[PDB]
């Protein structure tokens, strides 16, 4: 791989191997009095501030210098320009990568195959706006002439997780919008338990699918259509209760959806970057097109910040480089995203798709296998809940986990005169601090003595109450979680992923594993029907199928 | 540490270092025709079957022999007996570990301080049963004489995640039960968005807290009580709408809860093992006490299976030992739990608490630091959704992740004459297979040629569509996800965790980490009030607080 061959990478690996033991957070904070100032970024978006405090990380002045040097050496700025200019950086599929275009509020031209994509981008948005205004008011009526109370998105993966996470995150902005439902799994539970709660007279179905061929989405869409027509009995009513979000015009019309009920997007819109496109119609229906514009505007601000800011002060760039430092030097397999916000319960899950589906690769731009670590395993749950659970392994486990702590300063619900948010903020701060400093053998001994413990019981219990500390955190604090701020935060991580993949020399925009998954369950599918034994596969698969066939009619 | 010193452990490490390259799944399955039979367990509970297919793992006959040898050498059977007999195996806190007692349907005596715990266990269950029957029918009325339509659990961690996961998993058994709500986070969003949907005339609040001191739970409980009394105006009505689940009798009465509205449990009931106790009152209210009995009965079956089965055929034992093999030899930081069931969406999250809060340790039984890896990072999301996302890093990443695939044979919703479940089953099977076999350079070349690709475009795209394979899976197939089967499945993993912690010589039942978290916020809490700058902490913490104080009075 090209990365292991790089001179700045080898310089960074050499420093790490020599000065690893001298990287102590408690020792560094009382050495450099202005460490916070030297290792933090204040971003003013004019719609809220973002503090990216990376001072609780295992870096000095020299380490950040070398990491910035690697970004230049791997050609991050050049690669960035190729993306924003509309060049075909998704080489494996022969596609541009333009999620940035979907939110380009400046309307500055972006050229794909000598043609500006912007007029078509803005046209779909206009169609979205009109549709939303029509549905949300009551202008768009059902087959019985009833106003839409329920919006149902049928889609999986990128055609699901984006709008799900965003509608959950921006829930208090959904006043006077219809309820949103998200059917994704093939599991009949998902579609069945949903339809049992809906009335077909006042329900709108959205068939979110880029290809419009995906088994899960199409099957779920056909079931809903069958469920709807069982009560309506009129094929003409489908044009009132069904809309599609796709690139494939032929497949949409073939399904039975009116060609004027289709909201287009393009192949340079990857699934895990599609919420910004027509895929976000469910978001725009829930919180309104105004808030959806604000969402795109926030992302736009972050795109502009990423493109114009020097690398040493660039937010997604610095976050990405801290990642490289822990993955390719410290050996960290994981990266934890811990939002101190209940609206952001699906945030960690969204970037579990976003990051892992992008940087979960092993083949370079040339075609050679990598001889270094690529993308991490991304996971997390909102605070404070995690403190009472997995934080135990973070504080006292045997594995290093770099964490991203995130929190709005202002809460959507300032109940009890701000008492709940005050505790939430206090906990946010205290936890990052505790991970940094810890509790020594002497500090634990003094605490046990004041409470009341005998020298025989105290000494046995002593090492168990000791916290080694020296665990790295990023503290990302923002003014308020508004549509705009969420847009900026999502886009920040989008480019964080992008920068990492460029350094690793991998394609962050192909998905050959998920492409494989869409073909696999066609070989096994016919072999499940009947009661006859299967031997066409390996010993494991065969045995599994025969067990399934056996247990199929068993009374329990 | 005692583990690294063990002779069987060193024998296993030596085999791994010599015969790592000879462990190829494709090579093994066409060598041993009956590999499935040699590496799988069929368990008949008489309330459904469980197939634990561990044949897709990187083990031979010799490896399983050595792993069983390590279990004996570390004294797993002896330690097991100490737990079930009521001995104080939670040495650090001086407590027994008896979640197994809470579900002991045989009623065989278990002695703690020379006294049988069973009569007190069964007494709380009787009180639970009566209360449930009273509430679910309509016998227990509100302050306005209205029947309870809404049940709200206020608790965090172990006082939350168990009942949440179980009520979500057993949702189709909740017919004629009240709706269940789960408030956990201190974040005022959680409590506020809930109360906005409830009517205080028909709402029952459950204050789930072992200690009854926890800041999150108590604050959330006080807010709900204040919200209730704002509409009721009578302190006597609190005895009609508020109940407590605790060990502390004094704290419950102090809060204002009637002493006859308390459902007791004990200190040998750890939070992450408390769903079985009075903590599961929300479960019993939702699906009924009969189904809650079935849940405990299923766990009981699994406890009995764990206690009586020889180690080489024991389910939690084998699953635990495969974990040790990947963590302490292969170096795997993570373990993925992937249920192919939409009712089990919180299953992976529950064991993220269960496993990580138990085995996230670094100090032995003696007090010495470990010189080996302990518990993994546990994560996952339900199938098939994951296939379109993070499975990319599982199939083509640079990190080894052992996966547990789980699926019921029978579905709660067999819609479209079983079409949805057929696809779900097909996908379950095809994915575990693909991870095992993969796709070679020649297999990928032949597929691209049949579709239609030029020799110049085909060769550039070829290495990117190649799957190395040789990725381990466990396929756990069960007849149906019923209250009983869920109980067995949860208990299976409970003991899996237990066996692992015994081999590592750590205390799987202490939680210094979470106990630290409950004290940390006290120092920062008063320093947040006002607009004055803070300098009492380190540079990072100080800067963070001053940013918060600044953005407090911004308007967006
Ligand atoms: N087995 C321990 C599991 N993990 C925990 O102890 C915490 O999550 C515990 O459940 C919560 O902190 C709740 O505390 P309380 O129940 O009010 O005393
Ligand atoms: O990340 C992805 O690309 C996947 O999650 C896809 O979004 C998913 O396969 C949906 O299918 P499509 O959008 O192609 O209809």
UniProtKB/Swiss-Prot annotation, chains A, B:
Record's GO cellular component terms: ciliary membrane; cytosol; extracellular exosome; extracellular region; ficolin-1-rich granule lumen; membrane; secretory granule lumen
Residues with the modification Phosphothreonine, per the entry, are: 108, 249
Q: What does this protein do?
A: In the cytoplasm, catalyzes the conversion of glucose-6-phosphate to fructose-6-phosphate, the second step in glycolysis, and the reverse reaction during gluconeogenesis. Besides it's role as a glycolytic enzyme, also acts as a secreted cytokine: acts as an angiogenic factor (AMF) that stimulates endothelial cell motility. Acts as a neurotrophic factor, neuroleukin, for spinal and sensory neurons. It is secreted by lectin-stimulated T-cells and induces immunoglobulin secretion.
| Record-stated family | Belongs to the GPI family.
Q: In which pathway does it act?
A: Carbohydrate degradation; glycolysis; D-glyceraldehyde 3-phosphate and glycerone phosphate from D-glucose: step 2/4
Q: How does it assemble?
A: Homodimer; in the catalytically active form. Monomer in the secreted form.
Q: Which NCBIfam families match?
A: PRK00179.1
Query: What Enzyme Commission number(s) does the record list for this chain?
Result: 5.3.1.9
N6-malonyllysine-modified residues are where? 453
The protein's organism comes out as Homo sapiens
Mention one GO molecular function: ubiquitin protein ligase binding
Residues binding D-glucose 6-phosphate are 158-159, 209-214, 353, 357, 388, 518
Catalysed conversion reaction: alpha-D-glucose 6-phosphate = beta-D-fructose 6-phosphate
Q: What is this protein called?
A: Glucose-6-phosphate isomerase
Modified residue N-acetylalanine is at which positions? Answer: 1
| Location(s), subcellular | Cytoplasm; Secreted
Q: Which UniProt keywords apply?
A: Acetylation, Cytokine, Cytoplasm, Disease variant, Gluconeogenesis, Glycolysis, Growth factor, Hereditary hemolytic anemia, Hydroxylation, Isomerase, Phosphoprotein, Secreted, Ubl conjugation
Where's the active site on this chain?
Answer: 357 (proton donor), 388, 518
Modified residue annotations for N6-succinyllysine:
453
Q: Which residues carry this modification: N6-acetyllysine?
A: 11, 141, 453
**What SUPFAM superfamilies has UniProt attached to this entry?**
SIS domain
What's the chief localization of this chain?
Answer: cytoplasm
Residues that the record marks as modified (N6-(2-hydroxyisobutyryl)lysine) are: 33
A Pfam family found in this protein is PGI
What's known about how it's activated or inhibited?
A: Strongly inhibited by erythrose 4-phosphate.
Q: Per the record, what is the consequence of mutating residue 471 to C?
A: In CNSHA4; Strongly reduced glucose-6-phosphate isomerase activity
The organism's place on the tree of life at top rank: Eukaryota
Q: Which gene encodes it?
A: GPI
């Amino acid at each position: 791989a090209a990365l292991t061959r790089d001179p700045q990478f080898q310089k960074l690996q050499q420093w790490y191997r020599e000065h690893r033991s001298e990287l102590n957070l408690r020792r560094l904070f009382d050495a450099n009095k202005d460490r916070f100032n030297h290792f933090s970024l204040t971003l003013n978006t004019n719609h809220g501030h973002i503090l990216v405090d990376y001072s609780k990380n295992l870096v000095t002045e020299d380490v950040m210098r070398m990491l910035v040097d690697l970004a230049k050496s791997r050609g991050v700025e050049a690669a960035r320009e190729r993306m924003f200019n509309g060049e075909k950086i998704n080489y494996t599929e022969g596609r541009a990568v333009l999620h940035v275009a979907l939110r380009n509020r400046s309307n500055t031209p972006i050229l794909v195959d000598g043609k500006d994509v912007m007029p078509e981008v803005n046209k779909v948005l206009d169609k979205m706006k009109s549709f939303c205004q029509r549905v949300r008011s009551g202008d768009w009526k059902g087959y019985t002439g009833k106003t839409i109370t329920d919006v149902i998105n049928i889609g999986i993966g990128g055609s699901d997780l984006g709008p799900l996470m965003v509608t959950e995150a921006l829930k208090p902005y959904s006043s006077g919008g219809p309820r949103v439902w998200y059917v994704s799994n093939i599991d009949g539970t998902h579609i069945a338990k949903t339809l049992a709660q809906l009335n077909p007279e006042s329900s709108l179905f959205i068939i979110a699918s880029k290809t419009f061929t995906t088994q899960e989405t199409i099957t779920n869409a056909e079931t809903a259509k069958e469920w709807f027509l069982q009560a309506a009995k009129d094929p003409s009513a489908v044009a009132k209760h069904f809309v599609a979000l796709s690139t494939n015009t032929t497949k949409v019309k073939e399904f039975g959806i009116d060609p004027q009920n289709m909201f287009e997007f393009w192949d340079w819109v990857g699934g895990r970057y599609s919420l910004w496109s027509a895929i976000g119609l469910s978001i725009a229906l829930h919180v309104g097109f105004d808030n959806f514009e604000q969402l795109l505007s926030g992302a736009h601000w972050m795109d502009q910040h990423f493109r114009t800011t020097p690398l040493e002060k660039n937010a997604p760039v610095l976050l990405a480089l801290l990642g490289i430092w822990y993955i390719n030097c410290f050996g960290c397999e994981t990266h934890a995203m811990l939002p101190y916000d209940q609206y952001l319960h699906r945030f960690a899950a969204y970037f579990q798709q976003g990051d892992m589906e992008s940087n979960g690769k092993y083949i370079t731009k040339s075609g050679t296998r990598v001889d270094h670590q690529t993308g991490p395993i991304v996971w997390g749950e909102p605070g404070t809940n995690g403190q009472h659970a997995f934080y135990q392994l973070i504080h006292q486990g045997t594995k290093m986990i770099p964490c991203d702590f995130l929190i709005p300063v202002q809460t959507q619900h300032p109940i009890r005169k701000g008492l709940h948010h005050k505790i939430l903020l206090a906990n946010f701060l205290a936890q990052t601090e505790a991970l940094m400093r810890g509790k020594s053998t002497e500090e634990a001994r003094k605490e046990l003595q004041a409470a009341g413990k005998s020298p025989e019981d105290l000494e046995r219990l002593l090492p168990h109450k000791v916290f080694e500390g020296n665990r790295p955190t990023n503290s990302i604090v923002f003014t308020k979680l508004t549509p705009f701020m969420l847009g900026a935060l999502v886009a920040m991580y989008e480019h964080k992923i992008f920068v990492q993949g460029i350094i690793w020399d991998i394609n962050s925009f192909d998905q050959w594993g998920v492409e494989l998954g869409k073909q696999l369950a066609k070989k096994i599918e016919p072999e499940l029907d009947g009661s006859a034994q299967v031997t066409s596969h390996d010993a494991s698969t065969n045995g599994l199928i025969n067990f399934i066939k056996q247990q199929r009619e068993a009374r329990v």
